Design a protein around this ligand. Structure first.
Ligand SMILES: N#Cc1cccc(C(=O)Nc2cc(-c3ccccc3)nn2-c2ccccc2)c1
Ligand SMILES: N#Cc1cccc(C(=O)Nc2cc(-c3ccccc3)nn2-c2ccccc2)c1
Lengths: 767, 767
């Protein structure tokens, strides 16, 4: 082979792909193919001129002359891996200190696995694999270009900015697409972004495969209107060609990496279906001072580049007469007026090639400054140059590049990313072009929203499920994507706990209007203003007036013959019973409390006993005439009263008094005291016997004219008492109006008893 | 440097460490040190003679001549890594096809990382790392020696054979010790073997460290009496020296790998504390035909070994006058009678060095036979020889070695292990030596137990905790080793479920004598043979005889004046009541069943009512004289009887009859029918009133001479009935003898009632 030398004191090695890689037939015999234009001569000339310029600089590396050795790589593993052997021989002729290259991202791994055994640092300018960031295996590798995990960050930032949350996924097969898509998925899963379904395809498959791809991506509209493509430059062309035939154009929004960034050869002839796509590029401004040097070169005055003459002949398709490398293949002869300005195109990677050399030079300068202080040249303590301190000098380099940007390496030897953002939209009648609409600068996304969309309302939307609403909980099924839910309402009984669940609050409570917390329903019970309680009260007042008049009459005229005929003490007992019958409505109708309920359950069982005991003993004595002392009768009446009171006390002991809350319905809550069925039924059963005996005896002795026909009135009264007790059961145990009916029943029975027994007596004594 | 050539058609490369590794001062300038004896010249001569022999063999590789190239390695990475570069350069002078070596186990990795980039297979004969078994990283590596995970298998087999289950652990720091101990732990954990505590130490630490190691290992006796050392040859010497001063000798049993296998320089001066140790060696019989060739060599007639003259001068410490490599350092001149037979020692690794060459030759022969069939030589389809088919030809080699053993490679390119087993025991008065006591041959441990231990009872034991016993469960504290448990007994109420837990069976059951399954206790209840039931039965029979006699007398003499004076029907009723009182003991004393308990609860409540009703109505009529028809009295008695039967039926409805199992104590189970307190107390309360009325009226009318002083006997009878009712309560409700006492009470009361009421009547009527 041929190697390009340049003398000096410190030697640098470079591997540049000047020719095409050998075909499969000549892999074992090499024989590289055709010469390259962009990658072949421009890089070699740039390195030579950069070294000349850095030597002419008196500020950097004073009195030290740097050299170089440039070798071919042919974009093939074998050739580079042989030239590396040739380098490491001379290392063991000054030794090589560092290597710049190679271009490929898979040759570099095989060259590193060889160069790290002999402690040689390596810097690459176009290798962007994600496997090269592991410093356990690749300890001597550094690069000035962003990794493949920086595009997956800009893509996530762009998606996050525009509020997209349900997208597709396409990627080619290989290390590039697979690693990029893995990074994209890992970064997007942390920002609440979900993928419909990830796909996979070659870059040269058949039309049937592309049609099936379209049919499988069409089965998600209109839920996933954005496609996240991390594919190469031909998968996009295949997708556009497939879209053309099915008539699906003007519907999708393809978001792609820099495989399809600014290449016109991807959308030629298919500009109608690619409108709207957003792509990211790699920022790289041109280098001004390289053109003023590259164009002045002439074949007759270029001797340090052995590849120059064949390059000239290939480019101009002619033959150079009188030259050491004349070729007989070309019949035409070159003219003396030929020049290189004709269709001159600058290389698209000319910045990193210079930045790598500058980084290595700065590392050497720092090592010399920190190792040979106070001296200008090669001090005795730095001969020869060891490759273990240079690796630590290089990692801490930090300077400014050719374009005013900052160059620095992190702990992994990587570099920060800087990307542009383009947009393919129609300019006019049959005219399409890319235009810059933003940039990404290591965390700061600066994008012009006005230019991308003509109107705000025209923004494409892609969301799976609409958000919930006023009082709408989230219900999610099993096996589905986390961002495809359903909104359902809680019932009126239960409020909403959080975004995910309802919650049912305890009885007696009710959710508020905001559905944030159940509040307590105020207790509701009877009211004085209702006509029924006031009617009961006025009835009771009339009854008290009547009984007061009757007792006043009897007290005033206690010596009358009528009073002498009857029994005074028994009449007083009956009057007291009637008064206590009247005076239970005030206790009953009031708001329930501690002792009020006890008084109401005591009076209802006491009042129907004291009067009826005396009345039954009187009627029993009268029937016996047809133990005659009044003291015995009073003792018997008091004994029966005591028995009734003992029964009442036993009922009290069985169930102690208490206040109770009623829950008839969810909406309303009442307030009724402790009142069971037993404590009411038992006194009724006990007092039924007395009235039954009274009725029997009154029927037996209903035809005696004693005491102005007293027996007739005594027999006629009982009918009402018995019929009232009878009617008191059904409607008491058949509705929710217990208080009013049990307040009217006792009063009505007492008033009929008082009006059918004593009214004739007072009427007769009056006149 | 210098390389040893040998011509031919196929070239093989070898790396042999002829010199000592350069010191730290000359690492960058090489300058290897002193010449080696075993590793330097013997291996080179063996390879040369082996190639000569295989060329002379007409049945292997016909008409093809093999060659070789031997280079130094100096046991250093740099020198071998330069000679490998020289090899792979000439591969790109016939190319090298394979490399044998190097000796070291860490240089080999660095040489493999270089040789696998250019597709060169490699075979090693003394590298035994466990990192070289990964074919993802080391695809071109093969070896004929067992890995370091084969000693960890023989150790586990030896420990498992002798029933040791609690051992210590010691290992030196490095790849060797750490990897071996990791393998040992992983293999031992699967066979129920536990480690007390693993340790770790240098091989050159201070005396204080070794003393601390002894003090930390002394804190486990006598539970861990076996130490599993996987350390190098100097850690054992340090342990012995440390044991010497503390006077701990003659106690331990050191089990070690082949770092301390047969080396006398480890137990010299300390044979007293190393007695009993068991070590494993590597099987390697000597090669006979190498000695007949190596000894005949002379310095004057050896020209193909450039290292020979310096070797001779170094070995004999003289100067070879008149030689191309004469040295002036040695003043003494060599003698013509010198020979190599003096102190000749064979290399200890001479078998694998030949087996590797034979394996490579067999691989080449197989590839030639399978690629150019029907031809004898180099066919046109095998020029040049590719290194990708040789790697697959080599992996399937399977043949017989020099010592009659089988050589084959598994999928990882490894080899099976074959080890010996030694023993360091005293032979006599101040004499110690190693003796073979077994072997391990890839799964078959053949070890002579009789020679290791003089007597069977002298076997050293090492177990943490004794096993459980006849009915003992396992309880293990938290945080302790799984093989250190406690054996505890279940109580008498529970049996043992499994080896780990007890279990308590249900009530009425009992664990058996074997403590494997709870069995049911047979039901136990009353017995006829007991004196109490038969006494009750004979008492009842006597009562039946008496009542039969009385009723026969009354039936025969129904027309007597005495019978006319009394009431016949009431007397018959009383007789029937007494009969039903007697005939409750037969129902009661029998084994409980469905209806027997119903009859016993019916008779006890019926008998004390139907007689006493008639008696009380008779006495009431007699007291009233001082409704006289007998029909009214009979109707009243029958009405009271019906009321009693109604109460009985109500009690029956309250609690339906049933059979019940009693559980007074865990050991015994009874059988008593359903009998609550209410069903017994209620009839007694009901029938107390009748007897109270009877006794009150009898006391009221106890002085009437009617009917031969019948009132006196009627008043005297009641006393006994009342007293028996009274006595029946305390002891009935105060012991577990309910049946006997309630059987005697009714019978006694009926007997006294029948004997104090009718006996005088029959006595008078008789005479
Ligand atoms: N047989 C029978 C039978 C069946 C049911 C009930 C009653 C009864 O006791 N009626 C009654 C009589 C009196 C009474 C008291 C004092 C003065 C005049 C009358 N008040 N009450 C009464 C009791 C409870 C609720 C309503 C009313 C008897
Ligand atoms: N006051 C009072 C009072 C208090 C407790 C118990 C009894 C009572 O009923 N005694 C009794 C009388 C007779 C009886 C029956 C028929 C013929 C002769 C005697 N048998 N029994 C009896 C009942 C239950 C268990 C044991 C014995 C009365």
């Amino acid at each position: 082979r041929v190697v390009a030398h340049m003398p000096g004191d410190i030697i640098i090695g470079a591997l540049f792909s000047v020719h095409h890689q050998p075909t499969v037939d000549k892999v074992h015999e090499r024989k590289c193919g055709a010469v390259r234009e962009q990658y072949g001569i421009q890089r070699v000339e740039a390195m030579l001129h950069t070294l000349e310029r850095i030597n002419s600089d008196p500020t950097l590396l004073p009195n030290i002359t740097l050299g170089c050795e440039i070798r071919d790589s042919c974009w093939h593993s074998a050739v580079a891996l042989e030239q590396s052997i040739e380098f490491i021989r001379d290392s063991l002729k000054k030794p090589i200190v560092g290597v710049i290259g190679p271009g490929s991202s898979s040759v570099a791994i095989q060259v590193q696995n060889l160069l790290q055994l002999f402690n040689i640092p390596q810097i690459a300018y176009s290798a962007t694999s994600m496997d090269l960031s592991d410093k356990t295996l690749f300890k001597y590798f550094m690069r000035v270009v962003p990794s493949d995990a920086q595009q997956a960050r800009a893509m996530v930032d762009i998606v996050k900015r525009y509020n997209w949350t349900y997208v597709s996924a396409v990627h080619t097969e290989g290390n590039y697409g697979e690693s990029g898509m893995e990074a994209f998925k890992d970064m997007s899963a942390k920002e609440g972004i979900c993928i419909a379904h990830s796909y996979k395809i070659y870059s040269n498959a058949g039309e049937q495969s592309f049609d099936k791809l379209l049919k499988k991506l069409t089965s998600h509209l209109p839920k996933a209107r954005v496609v996240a493509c991390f594919c190469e430059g031909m998968t996009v062309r295949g997708l556009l060609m497939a879209m053309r035939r099915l008539g699906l154009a003007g519907e999708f929004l393809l978001l792609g990496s820099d495989g399809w960034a600014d290449r016109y050869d991807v959308t030629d002839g298919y500009q109608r279906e690619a409108v709207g796509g957003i792509t990211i590029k790699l920022q790289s401004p041109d280098v001004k001072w390289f053109d003023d040097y590259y164009l002045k070169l002439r074949p007759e005055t270029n001797h340090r580049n052995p590849w120059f003459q064949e390059f000239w002949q290939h480019r101009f398709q002619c033959r150079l007469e009188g030259f050491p490398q004349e070729n007989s293949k070309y019949n035409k002869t070159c003219n003396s007026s030929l020049t290189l300005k004709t269709h001159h195109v600058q290389d698209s990677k000319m910045g990193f090639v210079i930045n790598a050399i500058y980084s290595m030079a700065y590392g050497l300068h720092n090592m010399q400054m920190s190792l040979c202080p106070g001296y200008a040249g090669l001090c005795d303590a730095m001969k020869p140059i060891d490759g273990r301190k240079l690796l630590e000098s290089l990692m801490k380099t930090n300077f400014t590049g050719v374009s005013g940007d900052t160059i620095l390496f992190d702990e992994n030897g990587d570099s920060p990313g800087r990307y542009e953002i383009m947009n393919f939209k129609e300019m006019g009648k049959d005219y399409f072009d890319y235009i810059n609409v933003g940039s990404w600068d290591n965390g700061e996304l600066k994008m012009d929203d006005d230019e991308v969309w003509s109107k705000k309302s025209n923004i494409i939307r892609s969301v799976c499920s609409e958000p919930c609403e006023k009082g709408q909980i989230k219900v999610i099924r099993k096996g589905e994507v986390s961002c495809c839910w359903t909104c359902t309402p809680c019932k009126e009984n239960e409020y909403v706990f959080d975004e995910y669940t309802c919650k049912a609050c305890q009885l007696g409570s009710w959710p508020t209007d905001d559905l944030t917390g159940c509040d307590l329903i105020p207790v509701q019970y009877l009211r004085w203003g209702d006509p029924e309680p006031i009617a009961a009260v006025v009835f009771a007042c009339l009854g008290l007036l009547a009984t007061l008049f009757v007792t006043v009459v009897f007290i005033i005229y206690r010596d009358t013959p009528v009073v002498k005929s009857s029994s005074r003490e028994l009449c007083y007992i009956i009057l007291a019973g009637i008064c206590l019958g009247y005076l239970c409505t005030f206790c009953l109708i009031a708001k329930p409390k501690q002792i009020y309920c006890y008084l109401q359950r005591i009076g209802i069982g006491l009042s129907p006993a004291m009067s009826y005991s005396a009345l039954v003993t009187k009627t029993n004595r009268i029937a016996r005439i047809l133990f005659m002392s009044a003291c015995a009768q009073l003792v018997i009446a008091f004994i029966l009263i005591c028995i009734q009171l003992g029964i009442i006390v036993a009922l009290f002991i069985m169930e102690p008094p208490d206040i109770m809350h009623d829950y008839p319905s969810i909406r309303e809550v009442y307030l009724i005291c402790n009142t069971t069925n037993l404590g009411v039924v038992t006194p009724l059963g006990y007092n039924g016997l007395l009235i039954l005996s009274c009725t029997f005896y009154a029927f037996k002795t209903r035809n005696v004219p004693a005491n102005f026909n007293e027996a007739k009135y005594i027999a006629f009264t009982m009918y009402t008492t018995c019929i009232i007790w009878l009617a008191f059961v059904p409607i008491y145990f058949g509705s929710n109006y217990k208080i009013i009916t049990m307040c009217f029943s006792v009063s009505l029975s007492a008033t009929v008893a008082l009006g059918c027994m004593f009214v004739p007596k007072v009427y007769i004594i009056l006149a």
